[PDB]
Structure formats: C-alpha cells, structure tokens
CSV table of C-alpha atoms and ligand atoms in Angstrom, one decimal:
chain,number,residue,atom,x,y,z
A,24,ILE,CA,24.5,26.1,-78.7
A,25,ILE,CA,24.6,28.5,-81.6
A,26,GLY,CA,25.4,26.4,-84.7
A,27,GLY,CA,26.5,22.9,-84.2
A,28,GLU,CA,24.5,19.9,-85.1
A,29,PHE,CA,21.7,18.0,-83.3
A,30,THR,CA,23.1,14.8,-81.8
A,31,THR,CA,22.0,12.0,-79.4
A,32,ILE,CA,23.4,11.1,-76.0
A,33,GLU,CA,25.4,8.1,-77.4
A,34,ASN,CA,27.8,10.8,-78.7
A,35,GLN,CA,28.2,12.4,-75.3
A,36,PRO,CA,27.4,9.6,-72.8
A,37,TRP,CA,28.8,11.6,-69.8
A,38,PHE,CA,26.4,14.6,-70.3
A,39,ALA,CA,24.0,15.1,-67.4
A,40,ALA,CA,20.8,17.2,-67.6
A,41,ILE,CA,19.8,19.0,-64.4
A,42,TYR,CA,16.2,20.3,-63.8
A,43,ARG,CA,14.4,22.0,-61.0
A,44,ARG,CA,11.0,21.1,-59.6
A,45,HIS,CA,8.4,23.8,-58.7
A,46,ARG,CA,5.9,21.7,-56.8
A,47,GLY,CA,3.3,23.7,-58.8
A,48,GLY,CA,3.8,20.8,-61.3
A,49,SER,CA,6.5,22.0,-63.7
A,50,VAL,CA,10.1,20.8,-63.9
A,51,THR,CA,12.3,23.3,-65.8
A,52,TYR,CA,15.8,22.8,-67.2
A,53,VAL,CA,18.6,24.5,-65.3
A,54,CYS,CA,22.0,23.4,-66.6
A,55,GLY,CA,24.1,20.6,-68.0
A,56,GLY,CA,26.8,18.6,-66.1
A,57,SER,CA,29.2,15.7,-66.7
A,58,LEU,CA,29.4,12.3,-65.0
A,59,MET,CA,33.0,12.0,-63.3
A,60,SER,CA,32.5,8.7,-61.4
A,61,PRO,CA,29.3,6.6,-60.7
A,62,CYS,CA,28.0,8.9,-58.0
A,63,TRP,CA,29.4,12.3,-58.9
A,64,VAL,CA,28.4,14.8,-61.6
A,65,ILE,CA,30.4,18.1,-61.9
A,66,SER,CA,28.7,21.4,-63.1
A,67,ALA,CA,29.0,25.1,-62.3
A,68,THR,CA,28.2,26.7,-59.0
A,69,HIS,CA,26.4,29.7,-60.7
A,70,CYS,CA,23.7,27.3,-61.8
A,71,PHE,CA,22.8,26.6,-58.1
A,72,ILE,CA,23.9,29.7,-56.1
A,73,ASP,CA,20.5,31.3,-56.2
A,74,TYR,CA,18.6,28.2,-55.1
A,75,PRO,CA,20.9,25.8,-53.1
A,76,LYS,CA,18.0,23.6,-52.1
A,77,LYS,CA,19.3,20.2,-53.3
A,78,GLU,CA,15.9,18.5,-52.7
A,79,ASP,CA,14.4,20.5,-55.5
A,80,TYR,CA,16.7,19.3,-58.3
A,81,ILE,CA,16.5,16.2,-60.5
A,82,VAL,CA,19.4,14.8,-62.5
A,83,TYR,CA,19.0,12.6,-65.6
A,84,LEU,CA,21.7,10.6,-67.4
A,85,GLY,CA,21.1,8.9,-70.9
A,86,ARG,CA,18.8,11.8,-72.1
A,87,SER,CA,18.9,13.0,-75.8
A,88,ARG,CA,15.7,15.2,-75.5
A,89,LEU,CA,14.9,17.9,-73.0
A,90,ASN,CA,11.2,17.3,-72.1
A,91,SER,CA,10.4,13.9,-73.6
A,92,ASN,CA,12.0,10.6,-72.3
A,93,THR,CA,14.8,8.7,-73.9
A,94,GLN,CA,14.9,4.9,-73.5
A,95,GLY,CA,17.7,4.0,-71.1
A,96,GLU,CA,17.7,7.3,-69.1
A,97,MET,CA,18.2,7.2,-65.3
A,98,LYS,CA,16.7,9.7,-62.9
A,99,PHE,CA,18.5,10.7,-59.7
A,100,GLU,CA,18.0,13.0,-56.7
A,101,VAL,CA,20.9,15.1,-55.4
A,102,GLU,CA,22.3,13.5,-52.2
A,103,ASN,CA,25.0,16.2,-51.7
A,104,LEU,CA,25.4,19.6,-53.5
A,105,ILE,CA,28.8,21.1,-53.1
A,106,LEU,CA,29.4,24.6,-54.3
A,107,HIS,CA,33.0,26.3,-54.3
A,108,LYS,CA,33.3,28.7,-51.3
A,109,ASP,CA,35.3,31.1,-53.1
A,110,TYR,CA,32.8,31.4,-55.9
A,111,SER,CA,32.4,35.0,-56.9
A,112,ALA,CA,30.6,36.7,-59.8
A,113,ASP,CA,31.4,40.2,-61.0
A,114,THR,CA,30.4,42.1,-64.0
A,115,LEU,CA,30.8,39.1,-66.4
A,116,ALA,CA,33.1,36.6,-64.9
A,117,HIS,CA,32.3,33.9,-62.4
A,118,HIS,CA,35.3,32.8,-60.4
A,119,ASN,CA,35.8,29.3,-59.1
A,120,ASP,CA,32.7,28.3,-61.0
A,121,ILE,CA,32.7,24.6,-60.4
A,122,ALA,CA,30.1,22.5,-58.3
A,123,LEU,CA,29.8,18.8,-57.5
A,124,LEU,CA,26.5,16.9,-57.1
A,125,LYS,CA,26.4,13.4,-55.5
A,126,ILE,CA,23.5,11.5,-57.1
A,127,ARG,CA,21.3,8.6,-55.8
A,128,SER,CA,18.4,6.9,-57.5
A,129,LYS,CA,15.1,5.9,-55.7
A,130,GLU,CA,16.6,2.4,-55.4
A,131,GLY,CA,19.6,4.0,-53.6
A,132,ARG,CA,22.2,3.4,-56.3
A,133,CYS,CA,24.5,5.6,-58.5
A,134,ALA,CA,24.8,5.4,-62.2
A,135,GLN,CA,25.5,2.1,-64.1
A,136,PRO,CA,27.3,2.0,-67.5
A,137,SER,CA,25.3,1.6,-70.7
A,138,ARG,CA,25.7,2.7,-74.3
A,139,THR,CA,24.2,6.0,-73.2
A,140,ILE,CA,25.9,6.5,-69.8
A,141,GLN,CA,29.7,6.7,-69.4
A,142,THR,CA,32.1,8.8,-67.3
A,143,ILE,CA,34.4,11.3,-68.9
A,144,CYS,CA,38.1,11.5,-67.8
A,145,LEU,CA,39.6,14.2,-65.7
A,146,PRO,CA,43.0,15.8,-66.7
A,147,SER,CA,46.2,15.3,-64.7
A,148,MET,CA,47.2,18.2,-62.4
A,149,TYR,CA,47.6,21.5,-64.3
A,150,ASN,CA,47.7,19.5,-67.6
A,151,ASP,CA,45.8,21.1,-70.6
A,152,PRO,CA,45.8,20.7,-74.4
A,153,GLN,CA,47.7,23.6,-76.2
A,154,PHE,CA,45.7,26.4,-77.8
A,155,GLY,CA,44.6,25.5,-81.3
A,156,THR,CA,43.2,22.2,-80.1
A,157,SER,CA,39.5,21.5,-81.2
A,158,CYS,CA,37.3,20.5,-78.4
A,159,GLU,CA,33.5,20.0,-78.4
A,160,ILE,CA,30.8,21.3,-76.3
A,161,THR,CA,27.3,19.9,-75.9
A,162,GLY,CA,24.1,21.2,-74.3
A,163,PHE,CA,20.4,22.1,-74.5
A,164,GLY,CA,21.1,25.9,-74.3
A,165,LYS,CA,19.7,28.5,-76.7
A,166,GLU,CA,20.3,28.3,-80.4
A,167,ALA,CA,20.1,32.1,-80.8
A,168,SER,CA,20.5,34.8,-78.1
A,169,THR,CA,17.0,36.2,-78.7
A,170,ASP,CA,15.3,32.8,-78.2
A,171,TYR,CA,13.4,32.4,-74.9
A,172,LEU,CA,13.0,28.6,-75.2
A,173,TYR,CA,15.6,25.8,-75.3
A,174,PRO,CA,15.8,23.2,-78.1
A,175,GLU,CA,14.3,19.8,-77.4
A,176,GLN,CA,17.1,17.9,-79.1
A,177,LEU,CA,20.7,17.8,-77.7
A,178,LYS,CA,23.3,19.8,-79.7
A,179,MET,CA,27.0,19.7,-80.0
A,180,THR,CA,29.6,21.8,-81.8
A,181,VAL,CA,33.4,22.2,-82.1
A,182,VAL,CA,35.4,25.2,-80.9
A,183,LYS,CA,39.2,25.7,-80.6
A,184,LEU,CA,41.1,26.7,-77.5
A,185,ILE,CA,42.7,30.1,-77.8
A,186,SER,CA,45.6,31.5,-75.6
A,187,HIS,CA,45.1,33.6,-72.5
A,188,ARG,CA,47.2,36.3,-74.3
A,189,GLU,CA,44.6,36.5,-77.0
A,190,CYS,CA,41.6,36.4,-74.7
A,191,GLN,CA,43.0,39.0,-72.3
A,192,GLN,CA,43.5,41.6,-75.0
A,193,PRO,CA,41.6,44.7,-73.9
A,194,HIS,CA,39.1,44.2,-76.8
A,195,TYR,CA,38.2,40.7,-75.8
A,196,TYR,CA,37.9,40.4,-72.0
A,197,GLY,CA,41.0,42.0,-70.6
A,198,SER,CA,41.9,40.9,-67.0
A,199,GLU,CA,38.4,39.4,-66.4
A,200,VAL,CA,39.9,36.1,-67.6
A,201,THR,CA,42.3,34.5,-65.1
A,202,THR,CA,44.7,31.6,-65.2
A,203,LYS,CA,41.8,29.5,-63.7
A,204,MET,CA,39.7,30.1,-66.9
A,205,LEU,CA,40.1,28.9,-70.5
A,206,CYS,CA,38.7,30.6,-73.6
A,207,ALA,CA,37.5,28.7,-76.6
A,208,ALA,CA,36.0,30.1,-79.8
A,209,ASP,CA,35.2,29.3,-83.5
A,210,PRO,CA,37.8,31.0,-85.8
A,211,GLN,CA,34.8,32.6,-87.6
A,212,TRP,CA,32.8,33.4,-84.5
A,213,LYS,CA,29.8,31.3,-85.9
A,214,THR,CA,29.2,28.5,-83.3
A,215,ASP,CA,29.5,28.9,-79.5
A,216,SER,CA,27.9,27.9,-76.2
A,217,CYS,CA,25.1,30.2,-74.9
A,218,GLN,CA,22.6,30.6,-72.1
A,219,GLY,CA,21.4,27.2,-70.9
A,220,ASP,CA,24.7,25.5,-71.8
A,221,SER,CA,26.4,26.5,-68.4
A,222,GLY,CA,27.7,23.5,-66.3
A,223,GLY,CA,28.3,21.3,-69.3
A,224,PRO,CA,31.5,19.9,-70.8
A,225,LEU,CA,34.3,21.3,-73.0
A,226,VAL,CA,35.9,17.9,-74.0
A,227,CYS,CA,39.4,17.7,-75.7
A,228,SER,CA,41.6,14.7,-76.3
A,229,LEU,CA,44.5,14.9,-73.9
A,230,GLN,CA,47.2,12.1,-73.8
A,231,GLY,CA,44.9,9.9,-75.8
A,232,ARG,CA,41.7,10.3,-73.6
A,233,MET,CA,38.6,12.4,-74.1
A,234,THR,CA,39.1,14.6,-71.1
A,235,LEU,CA,36.9,17.1,-69.3
A,236,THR,CA,39.1,20.2,-70.1
A,237,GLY,CA,36.5,22.8,-69.2
A,238,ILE,CA,33.0,23.5,-67.8
A,239,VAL,CA,30.8,26.1,-69.7
A,240,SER,CA,30.9,29.3,-67.4
A,241,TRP,CA,30.3,32.7,-69.1
A,242,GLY,CA,30.8,34.9,-72.2
A,243,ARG,CA,29.5,38.2,-73.5
A,244,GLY,CA,26.6,37.5,-75.8
A,245,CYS,CA,26.8,34.2,-77.8
A,246,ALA,CA,29.0,33.7,-80.9
A,247,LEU,CA,30.0,37.4,-80.9
A,248,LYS,CA,33.2,38.5,-82.6
A,249,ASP,CA,36.1,38.9,-80.2
A,250,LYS,CA,33.9,37.5,-77.3
A,251,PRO,CA,35.1,33.9,-76.8
A,252,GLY,CA,33.3,31.5,-74.5
A,253,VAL,CA,35.0,31.2,-71.1
A,254,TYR,CA,35.2,27.9,-69.2
A,255,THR,CA,36.4,26.9,-65.7
A,256,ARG,CA,39.9,25.3,-66.1
A,257,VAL,CA,39.3,21.8,-64.6
A,258,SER,CA,43.1,21.0,-64.4
A,259,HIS,CA,43.5,23.8,-61.8
A,260,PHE,CA,40.7,22.4,-59.5
A,261,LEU,CA,41.9,18.8,-59.2
A,262,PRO,CA,42.8,19.1,-55.4
A,263,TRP,CA,39.4,20.7,-54.8
A,264,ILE,CA,37.7,17.8,-56.7
A,265,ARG,CA,39.7,15.1,-55.0
A,266,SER,CA,38.9,16.6,-51.4
A,267,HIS,CA,35.3,16.3,-51.8
A,268,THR,CA,34.8,13.2,-53.8
B,1,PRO,CA,32.2,-8.7,-61.5
B,2,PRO,CA,30.4,-5.4,-60.6
B,3,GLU,CA,28.8,-3.1,-63.1
B,4,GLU,CA,31.0,0.0,-62.2
B,5,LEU,CA,34.1,-1.7,-63.7
B,6,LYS,CA,32.4,-1.3,-67.0
B,7,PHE,CA,32.8,2.4,-66.9
B,8,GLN,CA,35.8,3.4,-69.0
B,9,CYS,CA,36.0,7.1,-68.9
B,10,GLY,CA,36.0,8.9,-72.2
B,11,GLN,CA,34.8,5.8,-74.2
B,12,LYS,CA,31.8,6.2,-76.6
B,13,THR,CA,30.2,2.7,-77.4
C,319,135,N1,29.1,33.1,-75.1
C,319,135,C1,29.1,32.0,-74.4
C,319,135,N2,29.9,31.0,-74.6
C,319,135,C2,28.2,31.9,-73.3
C,319,135,C3,27.4,33.0,-72.9
C,319,135,C4,26.5,32.9,-71.9
C,319,135,C5,26.4,31.7,-71.2
C,319,135,N3,25.5,31.4,-70.2
C,319,135,C6,24.9,32.3,-69.5
C,319,135,O1,25.1,33.5,-69.5
C,319,135,C7,24.1,31.7,-68.5
C,319,135,C8,23.5,32.5,-67.5
C,319,135,C9,22.7,32.0,-66.5
C,319,135,C10,22.4,30.7,-66.5
C,319,135,C11,22.9,29.8,-67.5
C,319,135,C12,23.7,30.3,-68.5
C,319,135,O2,24.1,29.4,-69.4
C,319,135,C13,27.2,30.6,-71.5
C,319,135,C14,28.0,30.7,-72.6
C-alpha cells in the first residue's frame, strides 16, 4: 500500500495472508485474501493461475507481520483451490479475477473466531455503495513501486469509490474497465494499493455492515494520477460464490 | 454452543 498507516490484524480480522513454499526452505508471500465463512477465503485467480498446485500454499489468519509470528495466528493448508474459468488477462485488466480457497488446519478444522479472526460480510446481489463512499484496503504489498521487498507490518489506507463513467474516460482506462469491476482512488492520488496487495479486500459499509465490496485486482503503476486501482466487483459474482461454497 | 456461531461478519472486537 502506498501511504496509509501501519496497523494490526485486530483492525482487519478477516484478512488472510497467502504464502507459497519452495521445498528449498523458503516460504514467500503471494497475495492477501479475506475470510468469508469458517472454511472459505476469497482472493484473486491471477495470484494462483501460474502455479495452481494447492499443496504448495499456506494460508495464515490472525497475522499482523509478514515473516514473524503473531500470537493467535492459525495456519491452514488449501483443501480446495477454485479459480474462475472465464478468467482472462489482457494488456492490464484481469477479467473474472476472483478465486476461492477452502482451508483446513493440521487438526482438520476450519477457522475459529478470536479477537484477531473474524469473517467479513458479502453484499446482497448486485448491491454496491454509491461512488464517493470511502472504503479501506489492507495488505502487505509494496510501499513504493520501485521497492523490491514487502513491508513486515500490515498496512491499511482509505480510498473512495469513483464512477465507471469517470474510470472509463479514455485518459483513465477506457473500456478496459467493465461493469464487473469497480475503481477506487484517493482524490489526491497519494495512497493506493500496489503489487503484493492483490487478492485482498476493499471494505465499505453497506446497509450497516462492513462488506467485502471489492478484491484488489490491477491498476497502472501505483498511486498514479488518473490511474485508479481496479477491483473485482464482488456483488456481481454472488451466484458464482454461492455455487461453489 | 459451537465456536462458529461466534463469528459475526464485519465485527471488529
Ligand atoms: N495501482 C493499483 N491499485 C495496483 C497496481 C498493481 C497491483 N498489483 C499488481 O500489479 C500485482 C501483480 C502481480 C501479482 C500481485 C500484484 O499485486 C495492484 C494494485
């Protein structure tokens, strides 16, 4: 996240950190995700597409730091890895960029609630906040586009939803943005999601609940003027979500 | 009653 503040998992208890094992000994961060129900985490297909080997990923819940442990964290293996079949990537956009991970611990259970592990709510069919709404994003992604390392402390920031009319202006993204995407930016193009933040949540208050309104998907550069962050529009994937969980 | 019921989506404690 470019800008923002450092935070702790208690402020985003549904955030899930996904890593990949290289039996050579290292475990590297891949993407973020969100806990939907005890056994299901939702993220973005583009984080897995290149290596759909579920057995090589590890998912942690209740984590405030990237490579050190947090007291209360839970470790899970990926029992099922569901990618969208109509996922497609083009020069910038990722289409149908949503994925589901069914988790299981070594004891054979799913997540349990704690002050650091909670689920986030899903929107009602095709129901979104109106543009102008401030939503927050969280993640362990880059703090500057030129960095080649990820921060060790979790970060969060606030961005506002913008209209499709504004985002589809030729000098923003044109027709690369579809009705199945949402754009969110900082009025002053100072804070934004960036590389490493994919798969994580765009949370807004909708009908009185903190709802998973979007999943970090793509963007040109990070915090660039007229280049908003683009998110998968969760409200338009509810049937898909329901069919598999 | 079972742990799962304690989940309350969207609530920060
Ligand atoms: N400007 C933004 N809001 C933005 C830009 C890039 C990414 N992410 C990536 O490009 C990316 C690519 C591969 C793997 C993970 C990523 O986060 C996420 C957000």
